[PDB]
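Anyone? Bumping this.
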Amino acid sequence: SSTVIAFGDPKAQKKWSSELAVDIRKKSYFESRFIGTSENAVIQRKTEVESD
Amino acid sequence: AGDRVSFDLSVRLRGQPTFGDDRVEGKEENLKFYTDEVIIDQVRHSVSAGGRM
């Protein structure tokens, strides 16, 4: 015959890759543009309880 | 050149001595040679190392 290491034989070495595939984060809409401390902002932030 | 070599054995002298004055010429033991032979043939085998996979 002739040697065949074949598929799935415990001799068949497998190499694991170190690089990670990441399901990247959904891009946020309400970024620093909209949120503001002034009156002219879609999302106002109230600093009346941040230190009190 | 050959495929067979033969080698011989010379067995001992077994016989009867002629006691007295009995005439011995003509009663002569023959040397017995025994033969044997050995023959030569090839003996080969082969091993396989797989593929490139």
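Late reply, but here is one note on the structure posted above: The two ends of chain A are 85 Å apart (CA to CA).
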